[PDB]
Amino acid sequence: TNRPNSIDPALRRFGRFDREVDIGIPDATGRLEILQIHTKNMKLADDVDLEQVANETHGHVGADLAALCSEAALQAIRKKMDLIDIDAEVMNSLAVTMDDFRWALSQSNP
Amino acid sequence: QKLGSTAPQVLNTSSPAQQAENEAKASSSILINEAEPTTNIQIRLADGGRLVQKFNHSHRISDIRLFIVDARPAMAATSFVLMTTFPNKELADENQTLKEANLLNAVIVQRLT
Amino acid sequence: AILKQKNRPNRLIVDEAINEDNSVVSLSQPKMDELQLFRGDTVLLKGKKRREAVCIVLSDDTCSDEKIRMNRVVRNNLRVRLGDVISIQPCPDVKYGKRIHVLPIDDTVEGITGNLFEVYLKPYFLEAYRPIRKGDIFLVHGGMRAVEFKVVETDPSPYCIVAPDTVIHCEGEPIKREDEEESLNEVGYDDIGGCRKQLAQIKEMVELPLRHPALFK
């Protein structure tokens, strides 16, 4: 659930649904771990830090980090534009920069 | 099949394996000159939409007939009057070449009589 | 950059000519040599609003020798604006016509229904090699008047040529002038200002379904 008190309190008695655990939001090193395990199947441009990016993201949920990664990939698509159709010269030259991550973090909605 | 006044079309009598061999023989029987500006002439065949581009700089319309005969053996007996794309003229005078008849990269539309 | 869209690619330019021929339009002879096009060959000129046009492009200098210009009727057929763009593709469309296809529009016509026996069918459309197309509201000669007829579709690969001997067969139904400029909500990026930044953002959101499913790597 997204809210603990919005559920009926009769379902939270001592016979049913007793253990309460919250996933919460990760830490800055936690968000660095999220970025590391999310950007595995993506070619970085080897200049990104992803820990400066993690410290720049405070109060961010993991799906928001996925949204920032998707917008960074869209920035790499837009900035390195090409022609119309496969155009395989763009397949082997994908690159996201730390400045592109900063630009994506500028238009971010946590 | 209605009893119309149009001419009866001829199907592709040549084999599909013999089509590529006939096209290769037609390209081999026509010389290519590198010292003259070559042109390519599209022949609008009426047997299904077949057009071929293999020509030299100067050829007669009878040489285009030779290219047609080497392209397809069944079309050697059909009488045809060649046409163009709206100057509304009929391409007679088979001894005339492409330069004198303004057939420089011009699509010749083949119409069977 | 900040907004890397709304870019014209290496695309051919559209303008308006004054030629008499309807299915034959005029294309630039230096552009004919550049795009390796033939004198008599017909191609597809890719306008916007999901509309293309099939016409024979000649080597005529009556239009611009830089811009490819066509008829006023073809301009209404392509449903485009002055200064638009067209892609060039030499793929042929030479298939003959099959059956009844037209719809009689009765503005200035001879033989109101017509039905396969007409002065603008048997003498005029024969020996012409015009590519008859789905939605061809043509203004051609024949039958003593400036005739105007709509065609619903043609059967084999809907943009296809006519035969010099086989007469095009005709339906009979009295219909009138349509409203194609605003009927199917054909207006696109040309008739919406809005926020062009947000129009570009919508375009960027729809790039990946549009012709690039494999751009997900």
Side-chain angles (χ1 to χ4, degrees), chain C residues 160-172:
Chain C
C160 84
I161 67 163
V162 303
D165 45 355
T166 311
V167 184
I168 311 296
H169 320 88
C170 290
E171 275 176 353

Side-chain angles (χ1 to χ4, degrees), chain C residues 22 29-30 41 58 77 90 124 145 158 173 186:
Chain C
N22 317 129
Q29 183 179 354
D41 208 26
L58 268 184
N77 290 354
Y124 186 74
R145 287 157 92 171
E173 202 195 298
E186 277 198 337

Side-chain angles (χ1 to χ4, degrees), chain B residues 44 109, chain C residues 42 56 93-98 129-132 154 156 159-164 168:
Chain B
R44 263 301 301 122
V109 192
Chain C
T42 180
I56 297 89
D93 58 319
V94 292
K95 276 82 68 178
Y96 281 166
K98 288 182 74 176
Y129 318 107
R130 60 178 63 248
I132 183 68
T154 80
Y159 50 100
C160 84
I161 67 163
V162 303
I168 311 296

Side-chain angles (χ1 to χ4, degrees), chain A residues 72-83:
Chain A
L74 277 179
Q75 172 91 322
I77 284 304
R78 283 177 262 109
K79 191 175 62 176
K80 200 174 179 295
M81 66 161 293
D82 272 325
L83 272 299

